[PDB]
Amino acid sequence: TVMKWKTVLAIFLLVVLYLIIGATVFKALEQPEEGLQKYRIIQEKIDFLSMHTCVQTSELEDLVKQVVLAIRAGVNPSGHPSQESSMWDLSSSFFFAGTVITTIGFGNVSPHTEGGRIFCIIYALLGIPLFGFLLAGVGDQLGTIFGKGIAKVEKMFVKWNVSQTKIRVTSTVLFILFGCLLFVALPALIFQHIEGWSALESIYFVVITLTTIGFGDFVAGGSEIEYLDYYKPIVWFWILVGLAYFAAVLSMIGDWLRVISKKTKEEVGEFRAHAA
Amino acid sequence: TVMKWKTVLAIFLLVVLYLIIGATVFKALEQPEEGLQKYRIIQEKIDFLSMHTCVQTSELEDLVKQVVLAIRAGVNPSGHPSQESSMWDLSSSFFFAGTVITTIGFGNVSPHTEGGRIFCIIYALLGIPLFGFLLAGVGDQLGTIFGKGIAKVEKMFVKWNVSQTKIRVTSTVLFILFGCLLFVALPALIFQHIEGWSALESIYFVVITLTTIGFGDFVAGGSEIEYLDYYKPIVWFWILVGLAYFAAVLSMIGDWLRVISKKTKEEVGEFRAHAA
Ligand SMILES: CCCCCCCC/C=C\CCCCCCCC(=O)O[C@H](COC(=O)CCCCCCCCCCCCCCC)COP(=O)(O)O
Ligand SMILES: CCCCCCCC/C=C\CCCCCCCC(=O)O[C@H](COC(=O)CCCCCCCCCCCCCCC)COP(=O)(O)O
Ligand SMILES: [K+]
Ligand SMILES: [K+]
Ligand SMILES: [K+]
Ligand SMILES: [K+]
């Protein structure tokens, strides 16, 4: 408790170095794709203006602006969207309120109005503590159930005499393998089958959603197709349990980082001490 | 610790009721705006096809699809974007990596490639514990500095004799007022002046960003204008300190919810006991 001011500066420098490395890698990987996309869109527009004589550049840019505002407003520009197929229905509003309290915030659906934004601010402010409580309760229940399960597994295991060492390592590898299998390996398959995504896109969606980053480029609910009535409830249940499992996994990764930090500190101190 | 299975069910029912209420309110507020937007875009397209004879509906829908894919790819359709003005530069990649580790995830900038997505998954998985450590350290430092400040304020206050009661209430109101003034009241003014947003949009942006929901509809960095060189670093510093202040405020709101829960439980038990 009460981390010293010297440790905070070192952690800050480590974080800034991590950001510099991530920025370099992202910049190196992502510039060519954006260059090709820019040439593709410019060539598409010049092709359209070449093919159609009547159109002129000012009107075409005005139409492109209208389309961009249409996407900003949340309405689909392409096709004739039916009035009955409202995107703000109770199932979608339920999904939106769940993302707000969860703090995933995909962003495909946004308020866009003064009253929606005010109610979003008050609703989020009240909502986050309540979900934090629910998540802590679900995490504790999951932890006790898994702990009793591996307690009886270990108890049965005592028939074949085994060293006390590596029993925790094996229990942890079993936890990681079962958790990834049940949370990332299977929902990725269901999402891929019901939506046409690729395996990497499905894994990326599961990781971004459960980690609560929620970029919004890949959203399970939002597509120009019709799903089953119970698809969204099942997705929310997978999200609720996955959030607990990922929070636990992140805590374990943090614990590993601390040990590596303590080990590095003692090793550096020992090398300093003999070095003289 | 180890929340009972009965409490978890009650918290789950409360959360589901909260989502039903939020969904109803959001649906009631947001349907008309979407209806008007849908009519506006349909009327704009039929007006364009009426004004231009040469254009036909299949080609116009194809052009709208090309524009929609251009927005999905992250490139601006409207205007001629210069090749030099890359959106994936080190300043932007730094902003993106900061949102990934922070878990705000605005979503304006996304990987879009197999290597970007794989590196995003590994980078986030390592990054979140490190930021959690940095955030805890900054929160502890802020708490100790504020605690010593109000310690000396209280010590000076003892000249005028005051009741021991309400001293904590006054310190907490002072903390809330100073924190909102310095974190939400002023950055909203700077964002509004440098970007043209309204006051409600600025307050909404600050709340969504610091709460880590990060919808992405309002992003300080992304606009079709040029800012000062140091604008993004100052924004990141405001985000780093704001995250600690909001985490503290959310913890206080959670503590208030717990007390109201304990008070409600004892009041219901007492009413049950006498009721007979
Ligand atoms: C993080 C918190 C975890 C919570 C996860 C559990 C989810 C709780 C459950 C249920 C439903 C919540 C809102 C449903 C309101 C439906 C009202 C309705 O009319 O359905 C319409 C939706 O359209 C549909 O009918 C089909 C699509 C969604 C399903 C409709 C209602 C749910 C029925 C089946 C699934 C619920 C539970 C299944 C359990 C596996 C909305 O249009 P409108 O109202 O304007 O007419
Ligand atoms: C949550 C963590 C909190 C961290 C907050 C502190 C931020 C740490 C600081 C600094 C800069 C990090 C990346 C900058 C790399 C700039 C390289 C560069 O050339 O600048 C170009 C950006 O364009 C510009 O020159 C102007 C726009 C951004 C500023 C450029 C560099 C920073 C100079 C001033 C501000 C830094 C610190 C000011 C302190 C108030 C990138 O284009 P390219 O590389 O392809 O040629
Ligand atoms: K988020
Ligand atoms: K987000
Ligand atoms: K988050
Ligand atoms: K987002």
B137 burial level (CB within 10 Å; 0-12, 13-18, 19+): buried
Neighbours of B116 (CB within 10 A): 20
Compute the distance between CA of residue B169 and CA of residue B160 in angstroms, rounded to an integer.
18
Distance A104 CA to ligand 3 centre (A): 4
What is residue B206's three-state secondary structure? Answer: helix
Technique employed here was: cryo-EM
The angstrom resolution of this structure is: 2.8
Neighbours of A164 (CB within 10 A): 6
Cα distances from B45 to residues A62, A109, A186, A255, B40, in angstroms, run: 11, 23, 43, 57, 9
Distance A1 CA to ligand 5 centre (A): 24
Q: Using CA positions, which residue lies closest to atom 43 of ligand 1?
A: A89
Neighbours of A1 (CB within 10 A): 4
Closest CA to A228 of A185, A198, A190: A190
Element (H, E) at A220: none
Compute the distance between CA of residue B133 and CA of residue A14 in angstroms, rounded to an integer.
11
Compute the distance between CA of residue A21 and CA of residue B100 in angstroms, rounded to an integer.
13
The structure tokens 């003005």 sit at B85
Sign of CA dihedral A102, A107, A113, A118: positive
> Which tokens sit at A144?
């006790």
CB of A89 shorter than 6 A to ligand 1: yes
Q: Are A55 and B52 in contact (CB under 8 A)?
A: yes
Compute the distance between CA of residue B155 and CA of residue B268 in angstroms, rounded to an integer.
41
Residue length of chain B: 276
Compute the distance between CA of residue B264 and CA of residue A226 in angstroms, rounded to an integer.
44
Q: Are B83 and B74 in contact (CB under 8 A)?
A: no
B207 contacts A121? CB cut-off 8 A: yes
* Cβ within 8 Å of residue B90, ≥6 positions away: A23, A24, A27
A3 contacts B38? CB cut-off 8 A: no
Q: Are B59 and A146 in contact (CB under 8 A)?
A: no
> Which chain B residues touch A71 with a CB distance below 8 Å?
68, 71
A53 contacts B54? CB cut-off 8 A: yes
Cα distances from A269 to residues A4, A266, A273, in angstroms, run: 18, 5, 6
What is residue A215's three-state secondary structure? Answer: coil
> Which tokens sit at B181?
């003034």
Q: Are A70 and A77 in contact (CB under 8 A)?
A: yes
The structure tokens 């989502």 sit at B19
Q: Are B229 and B214 in contact (CB under 8 A)?
A: no
B134 contacts A107? CB cut-off 8 A: no
Q: Are B63 and A103 in contact (CB under 8 A)?
A: no
Q: Are B199 and B185 in contact (CB under 8 A)?
A: no
Cα distances from A178 to residues A102, A152, A172, A185, in angstroms, run: 24, 16, 10, 10
Secondary structure letter of residue A211 according to DSSP: T
CB of A90 shorter than 6 A to ligand 1: yes
- Name the phi and psi angles at B50, rounded to 5: -70, -45
* Overall number of domains in chain B: 1
- The C-alpha torsion from B141 through B144 and B146 to B151, rounded to 10°, is -170
Q: Are B104 and A67 in contact (CB under 8 A)?
A: no
Distance A46 CA to ligand 1 centre (A): 46
A19 contacts B88? CB cut-off 8 A: no
Which amino acid is residue A227, in one-letter code? Y
Q: Are B38 and A28 in contact (CB under 8 A)?
A: no
CA B208 to chain centre: 2
The structure tokens 């009793």 sit at A148
Closest CA to B229 of B239, B241, B218, B221: B221
* Cβ within 8 Å of residue B254, ≥6 positions away: A129, A132, A133
Cβ < 6 A, ligand 2 pocket: A 15-16; B 89-91, 94, 98, 229-230, 233-234, 236-237, 240
- What's the distance, Cα to Cα, between the start and end of chain A in Å? 33
> Which tokens sit at A64?
């492109």
Task: Give the range of the structural domain holding residue A272, as residue numbers without chain letter.
Answer: 1-276
> Which chain B residues touch A217 with a CB distance below 8 Å?
72, 107, 110, 112
Q: Distance from B162 to chain A by nearest Cα, in Å?
A: 31
